[PDB]
Amino acid sequence: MDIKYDVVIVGSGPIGCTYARELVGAGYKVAMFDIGEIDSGLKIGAHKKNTVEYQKNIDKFVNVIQGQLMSVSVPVNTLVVDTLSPTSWQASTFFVRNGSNPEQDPLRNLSGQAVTRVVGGMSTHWTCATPRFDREQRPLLVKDDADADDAEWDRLYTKAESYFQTGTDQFKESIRHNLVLNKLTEEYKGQRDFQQIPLAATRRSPTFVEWSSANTVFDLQNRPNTDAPEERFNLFPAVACERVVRNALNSEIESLHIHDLISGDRFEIKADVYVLTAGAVHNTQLLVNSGFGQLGRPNPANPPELLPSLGSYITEQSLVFCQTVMSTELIDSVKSDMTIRGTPGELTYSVTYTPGASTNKHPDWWNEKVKNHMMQHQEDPLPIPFEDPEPQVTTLFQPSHPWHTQIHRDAFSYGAVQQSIDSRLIVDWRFFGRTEPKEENKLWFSDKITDAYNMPQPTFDFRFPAGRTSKEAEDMMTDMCVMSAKIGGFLPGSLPQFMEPGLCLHLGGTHRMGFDEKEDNCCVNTDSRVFGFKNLFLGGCGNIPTAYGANPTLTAMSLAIKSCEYIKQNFTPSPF
Amino acid sequence: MDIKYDVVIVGSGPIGCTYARELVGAGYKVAMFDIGEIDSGLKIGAHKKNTVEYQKNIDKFVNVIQGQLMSVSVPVNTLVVDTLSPTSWQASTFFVRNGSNPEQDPLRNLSGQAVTRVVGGMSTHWTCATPRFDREQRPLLVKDDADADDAEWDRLYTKAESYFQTGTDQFKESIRHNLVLNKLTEEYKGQRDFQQIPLAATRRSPTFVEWSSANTVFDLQNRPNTDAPEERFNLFPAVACERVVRNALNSEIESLHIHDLISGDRFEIKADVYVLTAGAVHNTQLLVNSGFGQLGRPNPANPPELLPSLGSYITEQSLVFCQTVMSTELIDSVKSDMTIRGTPGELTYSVTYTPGASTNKHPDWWNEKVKNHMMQHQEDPLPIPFEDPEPQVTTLFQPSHPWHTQIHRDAFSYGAVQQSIDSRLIVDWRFFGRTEPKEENKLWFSDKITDAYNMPQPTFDFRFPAGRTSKEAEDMMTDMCVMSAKIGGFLPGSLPQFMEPGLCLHLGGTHRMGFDEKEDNCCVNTDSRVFGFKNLFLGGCGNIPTAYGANPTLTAMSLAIKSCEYIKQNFTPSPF
Amino acid sequence: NTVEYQKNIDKFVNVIQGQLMSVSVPVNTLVVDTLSPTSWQASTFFVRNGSNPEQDPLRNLSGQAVTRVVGGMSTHWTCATPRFDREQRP
Amino acid sequence: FSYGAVQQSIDSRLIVDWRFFGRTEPKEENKLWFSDKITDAYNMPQPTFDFRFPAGRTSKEAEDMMTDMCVMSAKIGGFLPGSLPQFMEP
Ligand SMILES: *Cc1cc2c(cc1C)Nc1c([nH]c(=O)[nH]c1=O)N2C[C@H](O)[C@H](O)[C@H](O)COP(=O)(O)OP(=O)(O)OC[C@H]1O[C@@H](n2cnc3c(N)ncnc32)[C@H](O)[C@@H]1O
Ligand SMILES: *Cc1cc2c(cc1C)Nc1c([nH]c(=O)[nH]c1=O)N2C[C@H](O)[C@H](O)[C@H](O)COP(=O)(O)OP(=O)(O)OC[C@H]1O[C@@H](n2cnc3c(N)ncnc32)[C@H](O)[C@@H]1O
Ligand SMILES: *Cc1cc2c(cc1C)Nc1c([nH]c(=O)[nH]c1=O)N2C[C@H](O)[C@H](O)[C@H](O)COP(=O)(O)OP(=O)(O)OC[C@H]1O[C@@H](n2cnc3c(N)ncnc32)[C@H](O)[C@@H]1O
Ligand SMILES: OC[C@H]1O[C@@H](O)[C@H](F)[C@@H](O)[C@@H]1O
Ligand SMILES: OC[C@H]1O[C@@H](O)[C@H](F)[C@@H](O)[C@@H]1O
């Protein structure tokens, strides 16, 4: 712990690590603080799902996700338990209890919102879907030249894809993937296009996908080390970053207040450049705790003088979900090229096909796997191989279907009844709607109540806006129903539903980006620099000022790359 | 990966690490293999619950436990789902599916049995309760001299307590602990004694308990290193140990077959001494896969010639559970020494007490905390401070109450209704019965079906024995009901119940210890040496041949210490 | 058509449930393994609790039920009486 | 309808029921038979079903019908949690 660094980064999630990669590599002397701890093995900040045991027991991983999502704001519980024994002590009111936030209106909450405090942040458990935004979802980096703007985003996204190792080829030989993809491609021919979900992942074997993480962007090892003898990087875990100290004119940050959670000591760290990548909730908390915006219940007139748009225009996506059980038509089609004689397990049973036949619907590799599976497992009534990877299908957001789609399999805790249904049959559907940015939709912080780290307690005042956002959310539900029906019926216990607000964890706009602070009601410019400040930058989904449905991390990373280019343009690294 | 070591240990759980500590410290050249991976941060094999974030959100840790318990044997699912859409594909039978074990009779299972594959084993998530066994629960180490036998166990347990850092003082200043403890102590005066649960843990602060683990016994760092320049230790994670190679006479093990799960390669490792500490299930699997006992459905006559008792006489404990909501009597007693005037939150409200008064039921420290809490939180109707640690109470197994008891709080996923009840009110009750060892109670392995690591698939043939075990299990339920009623009524949603067989994870007797292989129907002697073998040793709960209710790990560790003394007596470490 | 049911209409669901007796119930094969060790338990899922051993549970009309009362099912029915068009009609 | 305690949170005036009924093609293999061995509570031959919804048109229309309910219901409001679109038992 030196007192002085070239750059300090708050947060070791994938966006913090974007800054670290860019800036450590350019020869800045970098310090990174995370309030969480190293928690993912010897590869610091790696995806927890890359253990052999999780790749063999993938639904167990749902626990790992649940175990590191701590709810942001829980309303007072008013549920009546009246089957207590008469001896049991009971209050006469539903008092503030069990860590609930008394400031939170339960009917204006993002109840599903949660944060993760670990080195690697949420990239230690995330799903790895990294789609680009098209124009209608994306903030402008170049004013009045849409082709220039596209070009800039294409460069940024290409580099971001490189960092995350995004690809659309890891599932190309899956029977289930191809089955679902083909059917949808045919059913929406000339209307929608389908492809593999772009995933930040590298296949290592037919049963092992190394999911990308923060560690993929930046290995988080202290430097100089053998591999980077000329780089300077330190990671300080278990450090609560509390406050950035503003100069009088609000033109520079002078230091960072940190609290070492293991020793209990509080220090100040100085740096030329301060980067806040603490997540959409906690960047905001840190800023509000440093005298940006305003502490307390926003009151209608009496706006904050410093960054009045901070924590306003917040967006979270609507998320609809179901599972389906694959249709008979689709299962039969798997084995459409086979001649099947006799009945399974009897002496006369056989399954054959003619390789290369021009009337075959599938290529030989498909038919070989099916035939082998059918002959070698005559106790199994399904023609799909047991280790066949899962479907990873999308039709990306478009003006005529303005929502993101994932038609796939993720870890899931199946109920005992649903466990009756063979897993090969099951497909997950998650559709994500875009939410219009509205001033009245806020994340604020209590001036009285604190969180578990003694920081101002976040509170939401949010409803999905009326008009287009709501109407599209209901069209999106309908679209999932219509689309899913082409693949199979719903799985009982996983019928079409909206998920609780904020469960998708795609919160944006909390510290939002634009060209002009006043005219675009924003907090950072397109370099992610906080307006007025020479050396303060915010990274992450909180910057995104638009209505978007697609998964936002790639877009956040792209903005972070641009922010880093700025820092390289304006700050000299110190002599080594 | 050298080809030759002095000692090889299979498994990096707390019992493997007992061997490592003993033998690495004595100057043996030690190799340790675990099929799992490093997963608990930079302190290898540490308790996952020792992060600041888990100590602030303790119920989240239930997910961490669930996420690393993989079920040993799951029967074929026969549950009817008949609300599928008519288009959905459905089999005509309940075929073998979703990793279920077709060999497993669902009505003779230990359905709750699960294993953990991670460096540190189950000690990365365990509850840390480390009680001694009294004579009636404990195997004999010394024949025909009960005082000699006691002395030997006392020495072994003392050292085991040292390794685990077991104490009974970490909760001494908890209001809730003292409340429950006092009430029970008074109610069973002259009949039962109560104390703190002996816990393998060190308190670091009033809100932080560093829970012990494998890492506590042995830090698992490769050696020689700076701290131990003269020790030789290597840990090889992600290595499936498959088979121990027996000589012709069954008098020596010649090598260990290993499978590197990252490279895919298979090697043989040689050693003077082989120690198997893979857990009660997997020690047995490894032995059966090496030609000990017999593969397949045990058939009634046609016993295995080599270690015929292996996987017979298995014991698992009965576990009963409830939660209670603290009585009015008990809550009022917290504040019995206070004068309370007015009504909370009004100008005239006050709470006072006279320090040192001889008629006070509590000591000044209790009364100060209560008074302060009451005055400073007048919105809170309870007199218990918010960060008051949890109760950690037991009455240890005795002949007149032959079950272990824990009256405490562990991580729990509270339902939304139960979340209505203030957490300070809630106490967990878990009572554990002893199970008589019976020949017909078996763990066997399929000769046809394999597990996720391609090893013979474990299958249970178990029922809790008739007679004493069953009768005591029902008395134990009754005792929990009677005892819990003294503290409060049951919490709805957590009413008194038996847990599924094997959920307690205290499986024993699978490779059981005794003096004489034939006369005590056992597999290892009191040095934990496998009968006939000069250089094969088994560690862990599988050795315990008795009916026990208390948590077995301390007893296993004690046996491992004795086994290590033997190894030191008979094997020379190689020159460094 | 009682005043009390017209004032508490959702209570009438009970009246319907109380006179629908299932036509054919398959043998129950559900595992209960949280019984006390003292409780008596069979070793198989034997024919039990009025289940029909002839019924394949995966070829059933599990929701089929009959009503035995004067008035039959018209004592509880919903009263919807649409005509069939040609394509539905004999 | 027996509303669950959560669904009882939603004002009844808001709630609309949707029930769509599909037609089933008559097929020879779809049978109601009676046991020659087992009897019912009135000692009469025990009914037994051998039924599946037929393949082809009946199934396909049943799934279009589900879809139609989803599409149509969306014009009136969102689904009520606890009463999400589902097939009822046969
Ligand atoms: C949990 C989750 C998240 C996502 C997916 C699925 C699941 C279940 N799926 C997904 C996501 N995003 C994608 O684009 N596609 C996918 O398929 N998920 C969200 C994604 O994971 C996040 O958008 C992303 O990590 C954001 O990265 P970030 O902006 O770097 O933020 P993180 O939350 O990852 O990490 C921040 C970080 O900083 C710390 N912290 C917080 N407060 C403080 C303070 N005051 N001081 C110091 N450090 C602080 C944390 O401990 C944390 O590590
Ligand atoms: C999960 C759990 C366990 C316990 C508690 C609570 C919970 C939820 N509470 C508890 C326990 N015991 C106590 O005495 N008191 C407490 O309050 N729990 C059980 C305790 O945790 C176990 O008894 C103990 O770890 C046993 O230690 P061990 O005999 O060293 O076995 P482990 O299972 O911990 O680790 C073995 C290990 O070896 C590996 N392995 C398995 N098979 C192979 C093969 N073939 N090759 C190589 N390595 C193998 C694993 O990966 C594992 O790490
Ligand atoms: C229960 C139900 C039924 C209908 C509606 C809703 C509910 C929950 N809604 C509905 C119906 N039909 C409509 O067209 N529109 C609506 O909105 N329901 C069905 C309708 O109720 C039936 O189709 C109709 O009653 C048929 O009338 P039925 O052919 O006269 O048959 P029932 O079942 O009403 O009565 C027969 C009757 O005979 C007796 N019985 C049976 N076995 C014997 C023997 N062996 N011996 C002597 N008597 C016997 C019964 O006791 C019964 O009363
Ligand atoms: O359930 C919510 C999550 O689900 C996944 O399917 C997505 F990939 C995510 O982007 C999102 O956070
Ligand atoms: O629930 C089962 C477990 O519960 C705890 O309370 C005990 F400490 C354990 O020894 C045991 O494994």
Side-chain angles (χ1 to χ4, degrees):
Chain A
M1 207 108 55
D2 336 43
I3 286 304
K4 176 71 160 86
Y5 290 92
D6 298 350
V7 185
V8 303
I9 305 157
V10 183
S12 54
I15 310 300
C17 284
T18 304
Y19 283 88
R21 196 204 181 111
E22 292 269 322
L23 297 180
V24 177
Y28 296 85
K29 177 179 178 202
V30 178
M32 184 183 262
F33 301 90
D34 200 301
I35 196 164
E37 281 179 277
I38 298 169
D39 217 32
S40 279
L42 298 191
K43 300 190 192 199
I44 304 174
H47 207 303
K48 290 178 181 181
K49 193 158 64 167
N50 295 345
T51 69
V52 183
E53 179 73 341
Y54 282 124
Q55 310 257 319
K56 289 173 177 282
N57 293 269
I58 161 282
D59 285 330
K60 290 281 168 179
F61 195 74
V62 72
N63 304 117
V64 171
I65 290 165
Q66 302 174 333
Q68 59 183 40
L69 289 174
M70 280 53 167
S71 295
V72 170
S73 190
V74 182
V76 170
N77 187 305
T78 72
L79 224 146
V80 178
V81 184
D82 59 356
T83 54
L84 296 174
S85 165
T87 56
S88 275
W89 184 96
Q90 275 304 275
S92 286
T93 61
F94 296 107
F95 65 94
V96 177
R97 194 151 102 259
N98 284 340
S100 75
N101 172 16
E103 304 269 22
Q104 184 61 60
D105 180 348
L107 306 178
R108 298 186 79 74
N109 200 4
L110 291 174
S111 71
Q113 264 287 320
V115 295
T116 298
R117 306 182 181 86
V118 294
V119 174
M122 289 190 166
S123 76
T124 63
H125 72 237
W126 73 319
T127 295
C128 295
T130 56
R132 296 197 185 195
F133 287 4
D134 61 340
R135 283 172 190 190
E136 69 199 311
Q137 291 186 87
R138 205 163 71 198
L140 286 182
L141 291 172
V142 175
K143 34 210 294 179
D144 287 287
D145 189 336
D147 278 4
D149 183 63
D150 294 341
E152 195 63 25
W153 275 106
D154 183 35
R155 179 178 73 76
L156 297 174
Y157 279 130
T158 299
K159 186 165 208 216
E161 297 166 345
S162 188
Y163 283 0
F164 260 146
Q165 298 292 281
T166 293
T168 49
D169 63 342
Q170 314 97 323
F171 286 81
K172 68 190 169 166
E173 265 144 29
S174 152
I175 288 171
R176 289 189 288 161
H177 179 70
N178 283 291
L179 194 58
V180 169
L181 185 59
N182 268 281
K183 174 59 164 184
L184 298 171
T185 190
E186 280 161 5
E187 287 289 315
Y188 290 87
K189 69 164 108 298
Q191 312 189 130
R192 316 196 185 175
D193 295 351
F194 290 84
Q195 63 168 80
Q196 192 204 276
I197 302 169
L199 293 165
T202 318
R203 183 161 289 283
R204 302 299 174 177
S205 85
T207 57
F208 193 108
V209 179
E210 180 190 332
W211 300 94
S212 294
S213 60
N215 178 259
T216 315
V217 174
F218 188 60
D219 61 42
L220 283 166
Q221 288 297 137
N222 286 347
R223 296 162 155 73
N225 61 42
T226 288
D227 309 24
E230 288 156 333
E231 305 202 323
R232 299 168 290 177
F233 180 73
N234 290 89
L235 172 63
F236 296 97
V239 178
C241 299
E242 296 191 307
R243 211 165 93 255
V244 282
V245 177
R246 300 181 285 108
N247 79 348
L249 266 184
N250 293 308
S251 74
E252 194 171 85
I253 289 305
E254 300 307 321
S255 64
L256 180 57
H257 285 226
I258 64 167
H259 175 201
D260 183 318
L261 301 162
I262 305 298
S263 76
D265 295 320
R266 286 193 161 73
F267 307 81
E268 293 204 323
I269 305 303
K270 68 223 172 113
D272 303 326
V273 179
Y274 299 76
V275 172
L276 303 189
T277 53
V281 168
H282 288 131
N283 278 348
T284 317
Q285 186 185 51
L286 171 44
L287 291 167
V288 165
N289 197 47
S290 311
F292 296 82
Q294 151 193 103
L295 215 51
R297 199 167 283 289
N299 269 315
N302 192 31
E305 276 189 321
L306 178 58
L307 283 195
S309 299
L310 182 64
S312 284
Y313 310 89
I314 77 171
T315 61
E316 182 55 284
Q317 299 173 345
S318 287
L319 167 51
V320 295
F321 163 81
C322 74
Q323 283 165 327
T324 56
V325 177
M326 213 83 76
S327 67
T328 296
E329 165 185 290
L330 279 186
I331 299 299
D332 285 355
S333 82
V334 177
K335 55 196 167 162
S336 72
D337 303 343
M338 304 294 153
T339 302
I340 304 178
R341 290 181 292 163
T343 43
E346 274 18 281
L347 300 184
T348 62
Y349 192 64
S350 84
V351 177
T352 42
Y353 80 101
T354 308
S358 90
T359 50
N360 286 359
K361 305 194 169 293
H362 320 269
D364 283 350
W365 68 261
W366 175 290
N367 287 326
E368 199 65 11
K369 284 178 179 186
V370 171
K371 181 257 186 105
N372 288 338
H373 173 77
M374 296 176 70
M375 284 304 302
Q376 290 199 325
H377 300 286
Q378 285 169 48
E379 76 306 333
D380 176 38
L382 282 174
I384 303 174
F386 291 133
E387 299 184 314
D388 184 49
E390 66 273 11
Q392 295 288 359
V393 177
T394 178
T395 180
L396 294 168
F397 192 113
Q398 299 285 333
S400 62
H401 42 107
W403 39 77
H404 178 48
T405 64
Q406 296 179 177
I407 307 152
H408 68 147
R409 288 288 293 278
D410 212 341
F412 191 82
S413 34
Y414 286 98
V417 192
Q418 311 180 121
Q419 286 173 28
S420 195
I421 304 298
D422 187 287
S423 179
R424 290 164 291 167
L425 298 172
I426 299 176
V427 174
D428 301 354
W429 300 73
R430 298 182 171 75
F431 286 21
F432 305 79
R434 56 162 175 191
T435 290
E436 60 212 310
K438 291 306 208 181
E439 190 173 13
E440 56 268 44
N441 274 343
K442 296 187 194 309
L443 167 60
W444 59 275
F445 295 83
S446 183
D447 58 18
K448 172 192 189 267
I449 306 302
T450 61
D451 68 9
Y453 294 88
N454 250 87
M455 291 278 289
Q457 165 65 44
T459 311
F460 292 114
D461 190 345
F462 184 93
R463 275 261 183 101
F464 289 98
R468 190 189 77 187
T469 307
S470 291
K471 163 224 202 294
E472 284 186 350
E474 191 48 52
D475 297 347
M476 173 178 74
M477 174 57 93
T478 301
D479 200 55
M480 178 185 69
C481 291
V482 168
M483 188 184 301
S484 74
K486 290 175 194 327
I487 302 305
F490 310 130
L491 175 64
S494 292
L495 308 170
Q497 57 196 273
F498 285 83
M499 299 318 302
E500 23 291 273
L503 203 72
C504 44
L505 304 175
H506 290 162
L507 180 67
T510 46
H511 56 69
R512 70 203 297 254
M513 165 184 295
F515 295 119
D516 195 88
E517 185 187 351
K518 176 174 164 53
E519 217 203 293
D520 305 306
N521 309 100
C522 48
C523 288
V524 294
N525 73 14
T526 61
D527 302 311
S528 299
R529 192 164 56 73
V530 173
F531 288 102
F533 288 82
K534 272 72 158 82
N535 70 339
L536 183 54
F537 306 87
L538 316 178
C541 296
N543 287 341
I544 302 167
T546 51
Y548 55 95
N551 322 68
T553 308
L554 191 70
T555 300
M557 173 180 281
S558 296
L559 297 173
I561 294 154
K562 173 164 197 50
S563 179
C564 287
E565 292 169 349
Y566 181 88
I567 294 168
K568 295 183 256 208
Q569 291 156 351
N570 291 272
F571 291 91
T572 294
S574 70
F576 188 132
Chain B
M1 207 108 55
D2 336 43
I3 286 304
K4 176 71 160 86
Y5 290 92
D6 298 350
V7 185
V8 303
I9 305 157
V10 183
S12 54
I15 310 300
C17 284
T18 304
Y19 283 88
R21 196 204 181 111
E22 292 269 322
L23 297 180
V24 177
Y28 296 85
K29 177 179 178 202
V30 178
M32 184 183 262
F33 301 90
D34 200 301
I35 196 164
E37 281 179 277
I38 298 169
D39 217 32
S40 279
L42 298 191
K43 300 190 192 199
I44 304 174
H47 207 303
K48 290 178 181 181
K49 193 158 64 167
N50 295 345
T51 69
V52 183
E53 179 73 341
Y54 282 124
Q55 310 257 319
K56 289 173 177 282
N57 293 269
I58 161 282
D59 285 330
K60 290 281 168 179
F61 195 74
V62 72
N63 304 117
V64 171
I65 290 165
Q66 302 174 333
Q68 59 183 40
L69 289 174
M70 280 53 167
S71 295
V72 170
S73 190
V74 182
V76 170
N77 187 305
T78 72
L79 224 146
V80 178
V81 184
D82 59 356
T83 54
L84 296 174
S85 165
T87 56
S88 275
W89 184 96
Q90 275 304 275
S92 286
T93 61
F94 296 107
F95 65 94
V96 177
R97 194 151 102 259
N98 284 340
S100 75
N101 172 16
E103 304 269 22
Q104 184 61 60
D105 180 348
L107 306 178
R108 298 186 79 74
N109 200 4
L110 291 174
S111 71
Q113 264 287 320
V115 295
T116 298
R117 306 182 181 86
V118 294
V119 174
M122 289 190 166
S123 76
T124 63
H125 72 237
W126 73 319
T127 295
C128 295
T130 56
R132 296 197 185 195
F133 287 4
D134 61 340
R135 283 172 190 190
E136 69 199 311
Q137 291 186 87
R138 205 163 71 198
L140 286 182
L141 291 172
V142 175
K143 34 210 294 179
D144 287 287
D145 189 336
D147 278 4
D149 183 63
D150 294 341
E152 195 63 25
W153 275 106
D154 183 35
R155 179 178 73 76
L156 297 174
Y157 279 130
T158 299
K159 186 165 208 216
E161 297 166 345
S162 188
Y163 283 0
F164 260 146
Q165 298 292 281
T166 293
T168 49
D169 63 342
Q170 314 97 323
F171 286 81
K172 68 190 169 166
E173 265 144 29
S174 152
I175 288 171
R176 289 189 288 161
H177 179 70
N178 283 291
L179 194 58
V180 169
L181 185 59
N182 268 281
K183 174 59 164 184
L184 298 171
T185 190
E186 280 161 5
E187 287 289 315
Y188 290 87
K189 69 164 108 298
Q191 312 189 130
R192 316 196 185 175
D193 295 351
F194 290 84
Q195 63 168 80
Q196 192 204 276
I197 302 169
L199 293 165
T202 318
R203 183 161 289 283
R204 302 299 174 177
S205 85
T207 57
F208 193 108
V209 179
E210 180 190 332
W211 300 94
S212 294
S213 60
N215 178 259
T216 315
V217 174
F218 188 60
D219 61 42
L220 283 166
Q221 288 297 137
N222 286 347
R223 296 162 155 73
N225 61 42
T226 288
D227 309 24
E230 288 156 333
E231 305 202 323
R232 299 168 290 177
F233 180 73
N234 290 89
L235 172 63
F236 296 97
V239 178
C241 299
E242 296 191 307
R243 211 165 93 255
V244 282
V245 177
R246 300 181 285 108
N247 79 348
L249 266 184
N250 293 308
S251 74
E252 194 171 85
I253 289 305
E254 300 307 321
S255 64
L256 180 57
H257 285 226
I258 64 167
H259 175 201
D260 183 318
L261 301 162
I262 305 298
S263 76
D265 295 320
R266 286 193 161 73
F267 307 81
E268 293 204 323
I269 305 303
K270 68 223 172 113
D272 303 326
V273 179
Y274 299 76
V275 172
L276 303 189
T277 53
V281 168
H282 288 131
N283 278 348
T284 317
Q285 186 185 51
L286 171 44
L287 291 167
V288 165
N289 197 47
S290 311
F292 296 82
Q294 151 193 103
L295 215 51
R297 199 167 283 289
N299 269 315
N302 192 31
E305 276 189 321
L306 178 58
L307 283 195
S309 299
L310 182 64
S312 284
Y313 310 89
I314 77 171
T315 61
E316 182 55 284
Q317 299 173 345
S318 287
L319 167 51
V320 295
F321 163 81
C322 74
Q323 283 165 327
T324 56
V325 177
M326 213 83 76
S327 67
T328 296
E329 165 185 290
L330 279 186
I331 299 299
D332 285 355
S333 82
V334 177
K335 55 196 167 162
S336 72
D337 303 343
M338 304 294 153
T339 302
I340 304 178
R341 290 181 292 163
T343 43
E346 274 18 281
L347 300 184
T348 62
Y349 192 64
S350 84
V351 177
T352 42
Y353 80 101
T354 308
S358 90
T359 50
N360 286 359
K361 305 194 169 293
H362 320 269
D364 283 350
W365 68 261
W366 175 290
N367 287 326
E368 199 65 11
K369 284 178 179 186
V370 171
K371 181 257 186 105
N372 288 338
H373 173 77
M374 296 176 70
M375 284 304 302
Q376 290 199 325
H377 300 286
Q378 285 169 48
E379 76 306 333
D380 176 38
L382 282 174
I384 303 174
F386 291 133
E387 299 184 314
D388 184 49
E390 66 273 11
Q392 295 288 359
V393 177
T394 178
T395 180
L396 294 168
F397 192 113
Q398 299 285 333
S400 62
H401 42 107
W403 39 77
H404 178 48
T405 64
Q406 296 179 177
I407 307 152
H408 68 147
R409 288 288 293 278
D410 212 341
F412 191 82
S413 34
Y414 286 98
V417 192
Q418 311 180 121
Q419 286 173 28
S420 195
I421 304 298
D422 187 287
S423 179
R424 290 164 291 167
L425 298 172
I426 299 176
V427 174
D428 301 354
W429 300 73
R430 298 182 171 75
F431 286 21
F432 305 79
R434 56 162 175 191
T435 290
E436 60 212 310
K438 291 306 208 181
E439 190 173 13
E440 56 268 44
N441 274 343
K442 296 187 194 309
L443 167 60
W444 59 275
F445 295 83
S446 183
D447 58 18
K448 172 192 189 267
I449 306 302
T450 61
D451 68 9
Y453 294 88
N454 250 87
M455 291 278 289
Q457 165 65 44
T459 311
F460 292 114
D461 190 345
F462 184 93
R463 275 261 183 101
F464 289 98
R468 190 189 77 187
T469 307
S470 291
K471 163 224 202 294
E472 284 186 350
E474 191 48 52
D475 297 347
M476 173 178 74
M477 174 57 93
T478 301
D479 200 55
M480 178 185 69
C481 291
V482 168
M483 188 184 301
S484 74
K486 290 175 194 327
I487 302 305
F490 310 130
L491 175 64
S494 292
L495 308 170
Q497 57 196 273
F498 285 83
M499 299 318 302
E500 23 291 273
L503 203 72
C504 44
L505 304 175
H506 290 162
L507 180 67
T510 46
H511 56 69
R512 70 203 297 254
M513 165 184 295
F515 295 119
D516 195 88
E517 185 187 351
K518 176 174 164 53
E519 217 203 293
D520 305 306
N521 309 100
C522 48
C523 288
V524 294
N525 73 14
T526 61
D527 302 311
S528 299
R529 192 164 56 73
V530 173
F531 288 102
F533 288 82
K534 272 72 158 82
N535 70 339
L536 183 54
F537 306 87
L538 316 178
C541 296
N543 287 341
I544 302 167
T546 51
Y548 55 95
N551 322 68
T553 308
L554 191 70
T555 300
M557 173 180 281
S558 296
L559 297 173
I561 294 154
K562 173 164 197 50
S563 179
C564 287
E565 292 169 349
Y566 181 88
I567 294 168
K568 295 183 256 208
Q569 291 156 351
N570 291 272
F571 291 91
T572 294
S574 70
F576 188 132
Chain C
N1 295 345
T2 69
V3 183
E4 179 73 341
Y5 282 124
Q6 310 257 319
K7 289 173 177 282
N8 293 269
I9 161 282
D10 285 330
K11 290 281 168 179
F12 195 74
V13 72
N14 304 117
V15 171
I16 290 165
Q17 302 174 333
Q19 59 183 40
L20 289 174
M21 280 53 167
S22 295
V23 170
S24 190
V25 182
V27 170
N28 187 305
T29 72
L30 224 146
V31 178
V32 184
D33 59 356
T34 54
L35 296 174
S36 165
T38 56
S39 275
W40 184 96
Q41 275 304 275
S43 286
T44 61
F45 296 107
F46 65 94
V47 177
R48 194 151 102 259
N49 284 340
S51 75
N52 172 16
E54 304 269 22
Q55 184 61 60
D56 180 348
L58 306 178
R59 298 186 79 74
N60 200 4
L61 291 174
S62 71
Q64 264 287 320
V66 295
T67 298
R68 306 182 181 86
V69 294
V70 174
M73 289 190 166
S74 76
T75 63
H76 72 237
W77 73 319
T78 295
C79 295
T81 56
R83 296 197 185 195
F84 287 4
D85 61 340
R86 283 172 190 190
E87 69 199 311
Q88 291 186 87
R89 205 163 71 198
Chain D
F1 191 82
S2 34
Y3 286 98
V6 192
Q7 311 180 121
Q8 286 172 28
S9 195
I10 304 298
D11 187 287
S12 179
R13 290 164 291 167
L14 298 172
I15 299 176
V16 174
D17 301 354
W18 300 73
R19 298 182 171 75
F20 286 21
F21 305 79
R23 56 162 175 191
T24 290
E25 60 212 310
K27 291 306 208 181
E28 190 173 13
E29 56 268 44
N30 274 343
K31 296 187 194 309
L32 167 60
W33 59 275
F34 295 83
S35 183
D36 58 18
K37 172 192 189 267
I38 306 302
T39 61
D40 68 9
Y42 294 88
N43 250 87
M44 291 278 289
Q46 165 65 44
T48 311
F49 292 114
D50 190 345
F51 184 93
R52 275 261 183 101
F53 289 98
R57 190 189 77 187
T58 307
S59 291
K60 163 224 202 294
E61 284 186 350
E63 191 48 52
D64 297 347
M65 173 178 74
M66 174 57 93
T67 301
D68 200 55
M69 178 185 69
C70 291
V71 168
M72 188 184 301
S73 74
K75 290 175 194 327
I76 302 305
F79 310 130
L80 175 64
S83 292
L84 308 170
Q86 57 196 273
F87 285 83
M88 299 318 302
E89 23 291 273

